[PDB]
Design a protein around this ligand. Structure first.
Ligand code: NI
Ligand code: NI
Ligand code: NI
Ligand code: NI
Lengths: 287, 287
């Protein structure tokens, strides 16, 4: 038997999702699913109301004929404590973040923003957090620190014990030929022994006891990573997708580091994984 | 029912493997397995003979007390047409390649060398080639071309029809923020319509019809990639490992682009996957 982050017991909740661009089924489907299980309530900023959806007592529609004003309103709702979670609707991520990063809008803090995802992978025995798979493109040491910090906050917020973090690379030898290894090393040195952080580690070493041993790695944090820190966006994303498409993984994803959790789902995500993202952000709301 | 590259019918063969540093079980185990099914014959350059192994009529032992001379002999055996396949034994990859790349040793050609791997993934329906997962660290456009060229040669040599190639990235929007996308684009433009090459593509788009459609990608080469070209080593390697450790994949791997196929297996690989690498290189030998 394994540990699962997403159980068959529906998290319920009264938190408010502000949806920036509540249009198109790719956006609405997830909202329906949430309502079905009462995951929370919704503030919808959109062009064309779905009056079959907005009849729900937990739904309120805010007409916005502009993607600009759609992001703008959803952002302000959160700023004013009217919504707990920011959700990107049918608009570009660039448009949402342009407003999210606007300091006067008060969502930004000192932290780098980063995407993070939590996976239930049937061939793993516990939940796996992977970051950053969708936002930070080529983070260097400083950014990787912040990304790891955000991962830590997330682990703590959602009840992952004392997480084992693995800075991912292609090898565990630190070499000038492969900067990801060097940056991995310097991230590890930032934290020292404050947390269980290690790397550079290839993936096998990070999540397989057998592989570690075969590579002469003898501790008990190897093969048990709770959090992987991608070396670059392409690695994080490939990994994310292989888990979903080949490993049969269930995954919830969010952008963290702002005053509220942000959902930024992609067009390809299954309704189930997009719901899972809602659930994750609900689990991330600390009052 | 799916197509499998590695069948239950054992490829047999009379080709000769030259093993550079035939020592330690991590190296020998694979050789035993090959012998069991008569995959081919062996020229072993090693420190300490295994006389239980070398009694085999298909095995000949060449005493070498140096990793240097171990690589050196295995290389010369291939140069002289005494062996068909070069296998790295219990020595560093750096030591093997130092001799492999020595032009006077005649293994090198005009081509970039690259690692490539062929996967049978139960949740995919046909074999998947992924490159480069272990050698080229940060290939740019020129290198990615060569890598793709090597992939093409490999596809042709092993009977993969007209392969669909996908230049992998985190997104399909080409942007200056993410050079992998730009380089992907320029690789695609090198080939034009000579082959089915496309990208930048995130992984979902490359190997899932459903995902492509969800992203407004309407052809019939999407969701059917036969070959993925990694944007960088960390992505290729992560992908390789997730397939093995999470997707239950069977995988054979080789370094290609030299006069003979080269096996460079890692300490963590299962004996089965290492055998699979032997089989792949047997399949790669063209006389
Ligand atoms: Ni606490
Ligand atoms: Ni520091
Ligand atoms: Ni032909
Ligand atoms: Ni060109």
């Amino acid at each position: 038997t394994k540990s699962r982050f997403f159980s068959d017991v529906a998290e319920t909740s009264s938190f408010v999702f502000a949806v920036a661009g509540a249009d198109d089924e790719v956006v609405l489907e997830t909202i329906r699913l949430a309502l079905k299980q009462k995951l929370g309530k919704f503030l919808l900023f959109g062009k064309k109301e779905d009056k079959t959806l907005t009849a729900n007592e937990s739904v309120t529609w805010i007409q916005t004929d502009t993607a600009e004003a759609a992001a703008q309103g959803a952002i302000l709702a959160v700023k004013n404590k009217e919504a707990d979670i920011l959700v990107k609707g049918f608009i570009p991520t660039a448009t949402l973040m342009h407003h999210v990063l606007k300091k006067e809008n008060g969502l930004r803090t000192d932290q780098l923003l980063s995407q993070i995802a939590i996976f239930d992978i049937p061939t793993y025995h516990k939940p796996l957090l992977i970051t950053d798979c969708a936002m930070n493109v080529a983070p260097k040491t400083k950014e990787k620190i912040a990304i790891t910090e955000n991962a830590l906050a997330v682990a703590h917020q959602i009840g992952i014990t004392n997480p084992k973090i693995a800075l991912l690379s292609a090898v565990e030898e630190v070499t000038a030929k492969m900067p990801s290894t060097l940056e991995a090393q310097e991230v590890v040195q930032h934290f020292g022994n404050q947390i269980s952080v290690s790397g550079p580690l290839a993936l096998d070493v990070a999540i397989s006891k057998e592989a570690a041993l075969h590579k002469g790695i003898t501790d008990s944090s190897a093969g048990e990573a709770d959090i992987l820190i991608a070396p670059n966006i392409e690695t994080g994303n490939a990994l994310y997708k292989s888990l979903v498409y080949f490993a049969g993984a269930k995954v919830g994803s969010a952008v963290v580091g702002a005053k509220v959790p942000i959902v930024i789902s992609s067009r390809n995500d299954s309704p189930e994984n997009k719901l899972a993202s809602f659930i994750l952000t609900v689990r991330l709301v600390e009052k």
